[PDB]
């Protein structure tokens, strides 16, 4: 349903975690090195793995 980080479902750019399958606003994940939504949204774009699933 809602953002695994902020727990709202407001409008924005969303990524699905490839580990747990939950969704997150890309803008709520502030980890260094993540890059831009663009690199995820395209075909064969990077895989998103949420902060908890990463390690």
């Amino acid at each position: 349903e809602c953002c695994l980080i902020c727990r709202s479902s407001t409008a924005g750019d969303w990524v699905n975690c490839g580990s747990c399958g939950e969704w997150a606003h890309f803008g709520c994940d502030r980890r260094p090195g993540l890059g831009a939504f663009k690199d995820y949204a395209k075909t064969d774009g990077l895989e998103y793995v949420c902060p908890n699933c990463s390690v």
């Binding site: 750019d13 699905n16 939504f37 998103y48």
Partner: peptide
């Protein structure tokens, strides 16, 4: 990744 853009 699987993504979406929403507006609600």
């Amino acid at each position: 990744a699987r993504t979406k853009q929403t507006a609600r």
